[PDB]
């Protein structure tokens, strides 16, 4: 049996840690909800 626990408020916070690239990828989604990189 799974259970839930509160982790916090959903708010946008200023001066947050800004990181990460923005890549454009050609993908395919199957009937099982699994994505795959297509080339």
């Amino acid at each position: 049996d799974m259970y839930i626990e509160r982790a916090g408020d959903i708010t946008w916070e200023k001066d947050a840690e800004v990181t990460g690239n923005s890549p454009r990828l050609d993908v395919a989604l199957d009937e099982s909800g699994d994505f795959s990189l297509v080339e």
Partner: protein, 156 residues
């Protein structure tokens, strides 16, 4: 039990100790998470029981106690914030500019951040704090890293 709006951890006691399996969002009496996190199983909030209401294996989404309530969307231009709730670690807003997942059905947003699989279900937020999708379903790139899509449901 606790039906307060906010981000929540999904945990299981089936294995050794208490293992986090994912994250979710309580919004308007409805708990929203990714399908692969729970697999449609009933969750529990203290003494209370959350039963699945809607679920789709292709959308990879599942709602509890009612229909899907998150309807906001990425604008294609603005930087977003992933409210990352990692296993054993404190919640954290991480600002990033998303990329694009080009598909035969249309383009989707994509956050490229390196987090454990147990972080699946964390809300991706806009500058207004609204939930524009969930983190946890995407692809594995040449570097072994994960690039998750911005998965939003449909409000009826």
């Amino acid at each position: 039990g606790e039906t307060t709006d906010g981000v929540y951890r999904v945990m299981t006691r089936r294995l050794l100790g208490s293992t986090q399996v994912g994250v979710g969002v309580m919004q308007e009496g409805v708990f929203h998470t990714m399908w692969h996190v729970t697999k449609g199983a009933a969750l529990r909030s203290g003494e209370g029981r959350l039963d699945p209401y809607w679920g789709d294996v292709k959308q990879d989404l599942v709602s509890y106690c009612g229909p899907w309530k998150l309807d906001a969307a990425w604008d294609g231009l603005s930087e977003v914030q992933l409210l990352a709730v990692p296993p054993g670690e404190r919640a954290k807003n991480i600002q990033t500019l998303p990329g694009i997942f080009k598909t035969k059905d249309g383009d989707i947003g994509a956050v490229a951040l390196d987090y454990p699989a147990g972080t699946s279900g964390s809300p991706i937020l806009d500058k207004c704090g609204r939930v524009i999708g969930l983190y946890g379903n995407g692809v594995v790139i040449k570097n072994g890293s994960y690039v998750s899509a911005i998965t939003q449901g449909k409000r009826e």
